[PDB]
Design a protein around this ligand. Structure first.
Ligand SMILES: [Zn+2]
Ligand SMILES: [Zn+2]
Ligand SMILES: [Zn+2]
Ligand SMILES: [Zn+2]
Ligand SMILES: [Zn+2]
Ligand SMILES: [Zn+2]
Ligand SMILES: [Zn+2]
Lengths: 114, 114
């Protein structure tokens, strides 16, 4: 069969599915808001963050990058990261964790913890 | 530092970067075209395919799914897959291979071969 989902891209944070130690999640940040911070790390999981729409700013270990549709970040395990919505529409992202970072309640696994 | 790229989302196929045995690639399929087929497999790499924009159809081991922005497929290693553009605008996708499937010339690695 096919392992498939159409992301609604309207959830603050929603864990989607996994396959062989990669896990997908949706994260949509409202205008004027941010997720993570200068002390926000996943000690054992890389996070591949892709911007589907909107405008924002990533700070990754003190390095700053403007975000737009098409922006891709490979956030290595252990790197502090913050994602800020700097526009006036939702900042829509899809995220790939390797290995997985979150349990079925959307709580961090040991690998997803700081 | 930050491992970052803004995808142009206008290349038929462009390998992007890797981190710790996950590799990203852009694939944009022109109207009336298709990539892969009923015999198209990566024997040793899963492929996570995400649709950024456009409209299409995936066939994965004979299973059919309409594709739109937000569509996510986890195409397991060994699964036959074909992606057809069924609209009249480009079908823009980003792809995550685990383990990596392609070398620096965009040719399949052993894991990316059928
Ligand atoms: Zn602090
Ligand atoms: Zn994170
Ligand atoms: Zn490292
Ligand atoms: Zn792995
Ligand atoms: Zn055939
Ligand atoms: Zn493929
Ligand atoms: Zn399997």
């Amino acid at each position: 069969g096919m392992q498939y989902a159409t992301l609604e891209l309207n959830n603050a944070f929603k864990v989607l599915f996994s396959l062989r130690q990669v896990q997908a999640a949706e994260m949509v940040i409202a205008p004027g808001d941010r997720e993570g911070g200068p002390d926000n790390r996943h000690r054992g999981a890389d996070q591949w963050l892709f911007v589907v729409d909107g405008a924002g700013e990533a700070i990754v270990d003190g390095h700053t990058q403007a975000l737009q549709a098409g922006s891709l970040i490979a956030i290595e395990r252990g790197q502090a990261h913050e994602i800020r919505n700097t526009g006036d529409t939702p900042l829509k992202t899809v995220n790939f964790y390797h290995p997985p970072a979150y349990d079925a309640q959307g709580e961090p696994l040991p690998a997803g913890e700081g």
